[PDB]
Ligand binder design. Structure first.
Ligand code: NA
Ligand code: NA
Length: 249
């Protein structure tokens, strides 16, 4: 789904120094209730991946029973050391940009699923709605939005060697207004998907009019020291880009 879909290219860089074993990439869907993943891997992992997602989901359900204000908080929430990993990572990402833990759920799940299986699939792309986690040794292009006029896809380049990384977008579907120029969208790049996902929410919230685009790229630049690597912001015909954001068309 757009935004954040792997788009197939032949790479200019491909630091896999062997390419025996695995050039064959498989693509499958992991669906567990309302968590819906699209995965590109070197092995067939749908089954163990659904079991793992099921488990992360159970932990959140249990944590929500214990901390009733967690699910709908619009502000940072304190969590103890004994809390589940998924809960702690979302809470931390949300606290860095001053939003609620659930603003980081989808990014957190994509990165954790990816971390759990990268050992058996060193090429691995986990797409969770508008959030995407990538491990890779070649150039990869992550599609953001189509250009209706051009007739084709606009994406962000993740150069070989720079993954693992998150690309997290402020909207999950398109959209209905969502295309190049048209419709509000923030996309955030960071190693920590909890931060990228919470930031995409914070930046999304701040995009109300054209003039807000500059407030987002400026704010993203302020957040470089806590992990923010780049931002793409679109609103009201204005497009602003900060940091490590090279577009491929
Ligand atoms: Na997507
Ligand atoms: Na978010």
């Amino acid at each position: 789904s757009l935004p954040m879909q792997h788009v197939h290219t032949s790479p200019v860089r491909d630091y896999r120094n062997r390419c025996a074993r695995r050039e064959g990439e498989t693509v499958f869907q992991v669906v567990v209730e309302e968590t819906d993943l699209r995965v590109t891997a070197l092995a067939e992992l749908a089954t163990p991946m659904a079991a793992y997602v099921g488990e992360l989901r159970a932990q959140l359900k249990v944590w929500m029973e214990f901390q009733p204000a967690f699910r709908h908080s619009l502000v940072p929430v304190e969590v103890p050391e004994g809390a589940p990993e998924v809960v702690r990572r979302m809470a931390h990402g949300a606290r860095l940009v001053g939003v609620g833990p659930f603003a980081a759920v989808a990014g957190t799940i994509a990165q954790m699923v990816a971390e759990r299986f990268v050992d058996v699939s060193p090429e691995l792309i986990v797409e969770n709605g508008g959030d995407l986690y990538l491990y890779s040794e070649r150039d990869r292009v992550v599609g953001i939005l189509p250009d209706p006029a051009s007739g084709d896809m606009v994406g962000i380049l993740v150069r070989a060697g720079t993954a693992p990384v998150s690309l997290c977008g402020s909207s999950a579907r398109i959209g209905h207004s969502l295309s190049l120029g048209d419709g509000d969208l923030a996309v955030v790049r960071a190693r920590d998907a909890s931060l990228a996902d919470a930031a995409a929410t914070a930046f999304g919230n701040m995009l109300r009019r054209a003039d807000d685009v500059a407030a987002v790229t400026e704010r993203a630049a302020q957040l470089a020291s806590i992990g923010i690597e780049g931002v793409y912001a679109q609103c009201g015909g204005r497009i602003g880009i900060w940091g490590d954001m090279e577009l491929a068309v």
